[PDB]
Write a protein that binds this ligand. Sequence first.
Ligand SMILES: Cc1ccc2c(c1)cc([C@H]1C[C@H](n3ccnc3CN)CN1C(=O)c1cnc3[nH]ccc3c1)n2Cc1ccc(Cl)cc1
Length: 228
Amino acid sequence: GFTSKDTYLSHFNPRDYLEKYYKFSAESQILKHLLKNLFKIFCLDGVKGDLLIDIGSGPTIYQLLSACESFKEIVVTDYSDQNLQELEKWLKKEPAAFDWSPVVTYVCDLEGNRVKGPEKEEKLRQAVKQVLKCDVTQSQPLGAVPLPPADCVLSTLCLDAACPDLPTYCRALRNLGSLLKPGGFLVIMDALKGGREAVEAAVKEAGYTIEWFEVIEGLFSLVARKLS
Ligand SMILES: Cc1ccc2c(c1)cc([C@H]1C[C@H](n3ccnc3CN)CN1C(=O)c1cnc3[nH]ccc3c1)n2Cc1ccc(Cl)cc1
């Protein structure tokens, strides 16, 4: 049930999935829980800095909506071109882009209705600085792009999309660490697909210290810091 780089394919039609799962019953419920958790990480728990890199963004922006409260600069990334195109239609405010309005409104509600949808959308659009290819199996997952050491790497539902075996996952997390300052944050929100202990081993062996781990089969979230 594992995927390797030689077997990986992402959904060819990312738009149909946005329409199905990101329009918000079971899926709406799960998305709400994710969004509440991301609110806590990025607006309460001290995960903040200048530069966040979202690894394996997929075609979605919901995982960045609270994060742009806490990071001036966000880089979104994906191995597959069709996911990057779906992101760019939205960032560039094209008429053909997915309508993230309902989710955006819901996040504005979680944040106390300090702003309305358009203002929140604009804050995210201003924060997203680059849209790039990544390959987590590479020592330099973003290739030659000369980003400075970042404050946070976020990975959401990546195991959920395709699960590598444990040493491959540990190596990916260690490759992602090359993107982080010492002490930089690693935030993972994903599917348990050896369970919690396997995730914890991969995180620790990839050179991070877990601050906390929460169950939110099943979904978890965790925040770790790269060894300092
Ligand atoms: C630390 C981490 C671990 C696993 C990850 C990710 C991060 C990110 C993803 C994948 C899945 C993710 N996705 C696609 C649709 N929705 C989501 C989640 N938002 C996008 N996306 C990638 O952009 C990606 C990155 N680099 C790669 N190199 C070879 C394939 C490949 C895919 N994997 C799935 C995956 C499975 C097996 C293998 Cl060997 C490698 C990756």
